[PDB]
Design a protein around this nucleic acid. Sequence first.
RNA 1: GCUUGAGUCUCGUAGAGGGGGGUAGAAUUCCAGGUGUAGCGGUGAAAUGCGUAGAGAUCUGGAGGAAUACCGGUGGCGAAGGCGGCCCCCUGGACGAAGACUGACGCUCAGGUGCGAAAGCGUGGGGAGCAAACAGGAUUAGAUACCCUGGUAGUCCACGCCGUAAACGAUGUCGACUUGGAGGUUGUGCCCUUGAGGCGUGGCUUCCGGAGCUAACGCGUUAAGUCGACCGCCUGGGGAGUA
Lengths: 100, 51, 88, 117, 55
Amino acid sequence: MRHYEIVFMVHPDQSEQVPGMIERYTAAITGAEGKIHRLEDWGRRQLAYPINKLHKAHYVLMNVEAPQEVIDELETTFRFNDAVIRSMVMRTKHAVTEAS
Amino acid sequence: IKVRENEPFDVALRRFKRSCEKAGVLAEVRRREFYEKPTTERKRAKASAVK
Amino acid sequence: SLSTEATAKIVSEFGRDANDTGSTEVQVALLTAQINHLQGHFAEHKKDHHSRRGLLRMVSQRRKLLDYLKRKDVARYTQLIERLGLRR
Amino acid sequence: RKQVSDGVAHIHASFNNTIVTITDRQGNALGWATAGGSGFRGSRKSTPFAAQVAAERCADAVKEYGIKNLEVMVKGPGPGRESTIRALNAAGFRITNITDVTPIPHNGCRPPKKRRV
Amino acid sequence: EIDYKDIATLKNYITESGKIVPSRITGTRAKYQRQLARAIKRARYLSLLPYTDRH
RNA sequence: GCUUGAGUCUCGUAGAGGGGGGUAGAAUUCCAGGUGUAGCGGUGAAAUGCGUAGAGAUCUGGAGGAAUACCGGUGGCGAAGGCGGCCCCCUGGACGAAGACUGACGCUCAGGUGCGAAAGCGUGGGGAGCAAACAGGAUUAGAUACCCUGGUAGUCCACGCCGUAAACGAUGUCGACUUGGAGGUUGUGCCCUUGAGGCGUGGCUUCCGGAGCUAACGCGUUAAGUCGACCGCCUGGGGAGUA
């Protein structure tokens, strides 16, 4: 059970489905007795460059400690889900809890 | 890159072009992939930068 | 390399006590543990020729220590290679 | 005709020729002029003079549109380009932006060998 | 430097056309120039910063 | 027996070390479409080439492949070959701090085995750019070249082969001792930090130089100095690294 920092953009037009998804994702973490340390919803933020053109998107910062298998199925969940564009999951850098 | 029109100007005189792209970066990418001449061109460039 | 809990378990099994972590049986058993784990790693990959060089250092070093312990105490040798299942 | 009143001057200076294309903000060309199409074929079509007369000649041939404002977009290196934008504010245009839009790869394609001259 | 989400800090250490500035200019000891650049690149993936100014 | 050699354990650090998988942004080419019109491209100059069947320029959408600007640095890592976007997974080594443990377990190494750029070969993919061969245009006395326009193998992937390079610090490996200076990079301790602190202690590395050595050039605590251990190799040029 190691640490991870997940961010992911969401299509703006499915922003209302954002907290639901968050819950499901967090639920999946608690399926493996891993804990979630911070969680931020950064709002519809303007993109520095267009992607499918699609400017301003909805960001979610996560920072979860978990075993690697639920992180892996969380990655495949981010693959198939058409809502989410650009996930990024990262390193341990042991558990953080702050803002930016 | 971009410079907006000023309210009272005749010549914009943008220096944006000079600080980056024109002189070196495009004249460098006109000619061959080596790996070899750059290692020695940089070797003698850093060996020339001496007092 | 190996887990801290794994290394602690092997030191506890093969040493006179814990903190006896440099004895010849202990070093041999730690090298053995890592050799087997990396058998699992190099069955896959197979072209990780750099990591394999580290592995052959482990094999050679285990061999040196078995030769030492063979020409110091042969009873410890036979008990050791009996317990680790090496020598074939 | 069609009375666009703002455009973009895409100047494409290369080492051998400068080619000036005045368009609108949508990107549809309204009229172009090259340095090689203004007399002086050859060693003389890559000079600042040839580029400025190319730009003078491209300022003509867009009189049918009433362009007063334009952005300038500059590609490539070349003996042109600098003189080129000068000719544009010698032709009554209000020059608004001057961007340099030279394509730079982020180490993409391999460039050609050449030139053991 | 260690962090990439602070794009105020990262935006100081970048030029007007999206390019990373050399440590020959900004001081920045080499360890933090390496963390810096790697954080700039993680931020450009997330579209927090731009890769260039002609997107 | 013993610990000053060698090794194990604890905690961290830096890193383009390796292998597998994914993704991102610029750019080149191609395809489809809009605008638009007489050239574009190229060169020392030209021509071949592309272009009123609408090129080049320009904007939109798509496909695909390869490489990964800036950071980038006589910077880093690796035994060497070599390794440069970002992220994950598996994995090798190095270095540092204090302490504990084993107790000479070490050094070198003929045969042997492994790894080994590039080009090349085999099977199966892929193929955007570049480009041996090749073709055309020039240049020229000639031009089987340099230059130009195209362009196939190849370069890219998987697995196997080859087994070499100016594979080079043209400097075998390991250990010990012998004046200095300026840097770089990565650890760390101490002390008003009361800066852009001070003072030390390691690892790797760059430049200059002292004694000494050297035919000289130069090397110079990372030795080509002063020694020890083991290995490899040399014995005039050619013929010939050939039969």
